[PDB]
Amino acid sequence: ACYSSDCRVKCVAMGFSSGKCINSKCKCYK
Ligand SMILES: [Cl-]
């Protein structure tokens, strides 16, 4: 599943701004 905290942290680790869980997907904000 997608979990909010982990998704945000994954996204930031890759150089994105943040991210959110949408429909089971961790979608990063650029
Ligand atoms: Cl979700």
From Swiss-Prot:
The record marks 20 as: Basic residue of the functional dyad. It is found in: Secreted. Has the structural arrangement of an alpha-helix connected to a beta-sheet by disulfide bonds (CSalpha/beta). Monomer. The record marks 29 as: Aromatic residue of the functional dyad. Expressed by the venom gland. Disulfide bonds join 2-21, 7-26, 11-28. Its main location: secreted. This is Potassium channel toxin alpha-KTx 19.1. The lineage of its organism: Eukaryota, Metazoa, Ecdysozoa, Arthropoda, Chelicerata. Selective inhibitor of high conductance calcium-activated potassium channels KCa1.1/KCNMA1. May be insect specific. The keyword Cell cycle does not apply. One of its GO terms (molecular function) is potassium channel regulator activity. The record marks 8, 10 as: Crucial for toxin binding. One of its GO terms (cellular component) is extracellular region. Pfam families: Toxin_2 (PF00451).
